[PDB]
Write a protein that binds this ligand. Structure first.
Ligand SMILES: [Zn+2]
Ligand SMILES: [Zn+2]
Lengths: 211, 211
């Protein structure tokens, strides 16, 4: 949904990308927000650890704020591609519309757009689409990547290098569950099935394996 | 963008459509909002002339609130059609996603979706898509339908029945500008061109003609 923080972060991202210094006055102007409101909002973002105001007053996005800012521009640009390539909305309206959509488009839709769209390297306005690497178009912890629904998936990593107990190593081996192997998953404990065999994992494995 | 008013109105629309009485407790429940917050928000909507609480405490949307509620469900359902038919998002996520998109999708995009989608009669979940008539998929007053950009358009009505001064009647006739005739338009006064001839309209005509 629509976020002010997300709006400030994408503004800083833009200026930076344009080659303009992230000053509170340029942001305020771009955002069409008063000066006092921006320092008010920026003071909040600092406390959240999303931005830090440097000596020269310019705003430096922390790694966390930079990641968020980048997902917003990716969503934003992926949206524009959707609006021009498929929907066919008037090119003069595509940016305005995408400015709102960037706050409501989920990562799952982005991934789909990456599959559906012919080319995702640039927005219709000549700018590159950032964060695609991070979008995932390594993986997700089985614990937080599986639900009561026995969805399929693919092994990106097992992470047996970080395992202390190795008793289920052969289990995975028997059930032919390796890296790059599509497998099912249901969180009811985590039991990733494959090769017709179910594997009810232990805390640790569920924490390290990425699907 | 995301509106609480729009959220309350679509909730009332749903219950009503389900055959449930628009009571503040069902809304609160559905919205997962406390009781006190809903009366707080509903008291606001009444003042806005969007809803009226009846004797039996149930909520009756005024014509204005009903129109708004309907556009939201239309946007919402048009969105779902876009998510399933084209984007291909997991069907179990389509409603959640559309719940957010309904607040950010403009009418212009809806019209496009109406052109692009194979069928807009029902949402993927079996419910009819309302308000298509009102979406416009009669017209828009040339005054508020033309800008500095000489966009094309189509005459839906001239409204000469409501004219007091009839001096430009023949002008329109000469320039072969009738109902169903595609014509250009630029608001810099309103001058709808057609048949290679420009017609700089007067206040009244600009107010009644719909493109
Ligand atoms: Zn843009
Ligand atoms: Zn829905």
């Amino acid at each position: 949904l629509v976020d002010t923080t997300e709006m400030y972060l994408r503004t800083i991202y833009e200026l930076e990308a344009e080659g303009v210094t992230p000053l509170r006055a340029r942001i305020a102007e771009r955002l069409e927000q008063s000066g006092p409101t921006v320092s008010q909002t920026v003071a909040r973002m600092e406390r959240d650890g999303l931005v830090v105001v440097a000596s020269d007053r310019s705003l430096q996005m922390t790694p966390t704020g930079r990641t968020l800012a980048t997902a917003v521009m990716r969503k934003h640009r992926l949206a524009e591609r959707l609006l021009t390539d498929i929907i066919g909305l008037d090119i003069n309206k595509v940016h305005d519309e995408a400015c709102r959509w960037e706050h409501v488009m989920s990562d799952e839709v982005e991934r789909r757009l990456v599959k559906v769209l012919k080319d995702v390297s640039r927005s219709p306005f000549g700018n590159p689409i950032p964060g695609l690497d991070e979008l995932g178009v390594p993986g997700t912890r089985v614990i937080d990547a599986a639900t009561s629904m026995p969805r399929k998936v693919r092994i990106v990593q097992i992470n047996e290098i970080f395992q202390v107990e190795t008793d289920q190593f052969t289990q995975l081996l028997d059930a032919d569950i390796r890296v790059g192997s599509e497998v099912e998953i249901v969180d009811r404990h985590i039991t990733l099935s494959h090769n017709g065999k179910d594997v009810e994992l232990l805390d640790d494995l569920a924490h390290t394996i990425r699907i």
